[PDB]
Design a protein around this ligand. Structure first.
Ligand SMILES: O=[As]c1ccccc1
Ligand SMILES: [Cl-]
Lengths: 147, 150
């Protein structure tokens, strides 16, 4: 359909001029399964790590937001046990014109600034709230082990 | 004014940032003062601010980088997290601030908040309350000021 072409143009431009600290590996055969690597941002517990993720464009894209999954093991209030990332504001504010680039930047933003109030991972969310420094130390350790 | 040694470390960062800014963000360092940074954020597509140009100043602050920089919109705007004097309040940035987070990131989160308001931490209570209780009038107001001032 027309959406395939739009995604291609959007993905090639994104791959050629990607966000700082984000790299996109497009796969010609399947453009609805985007492979992405996010550098652990400096000044965060993830500094120095490489976090692999995939962005699934659903059947209804762009009418619906894409679904993101970290494949690198991480401890984060908004990431499920199998890596599904829940970006509340994307689900709340989604419009077709927001773009894939924005989706990746918002994942990076959530990685840095978790939302423990509406956590997928209640254990990680309570830890951030009940002992912030320990949450950072444990995130740093897992970055060293898996990132 | 900042300590000269901090100005030194900041100078390289801003030079790099200005040469390769984030998409939709233009960064203008002043030829002399490196405690003030002029920035323009393009009104993101898919939001009530589409089509506008939103000009701000990033003030690093006497305690930078120990404390976060503070952004202020020169362009008048209707947004839950922008106060009467243009103060931009990014509450998560204040919560998670560390000295190595970097100026690029600060600007990216300001843009993120522009797209994704947080009515819980609203400095503009009317905009946060209107956003929750009556979104059409919220967007209409934000589009109106985007047209007038953007
Ligand atoms: As910007 C941003 C978006 C979602 C959650 C935290 C921060
Ligand atoms: Cl999961």
């Amino acid at each position: 359909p027309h959406i395939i072409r739009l995604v291609y143009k959007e993905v090639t431009t994104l791959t050629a001029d990607p966000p700082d600290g984000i790299k996109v590996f497009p796969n010609e055969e399947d453009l609805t399964d985007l492979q992405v690597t996010i550098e652990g941002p400096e000044g965060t517990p993830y500094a120095g790590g490489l976090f692999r993720m995939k962005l699934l464009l659903g059947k209804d894209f762009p009418a619906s937001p894409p679904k993101g999954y970290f494949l690198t093991k991480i401890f984060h209030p908004n990431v499920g046990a199998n890596g599904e990332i829940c970006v509340n504001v994307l689900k709340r504010d989604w419009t077709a014109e927001l773009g894939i680039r924005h989706v990746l930047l918002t994942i990076k933003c959530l990685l840095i600034h978790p939302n423990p109030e509406s956590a997928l991972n209640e254990e990680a969310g309570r830890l951030l709230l009940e002992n912030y420094e320990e949450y950072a130390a444990r995130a740093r350790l897992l970055t060293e082990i898996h990132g």
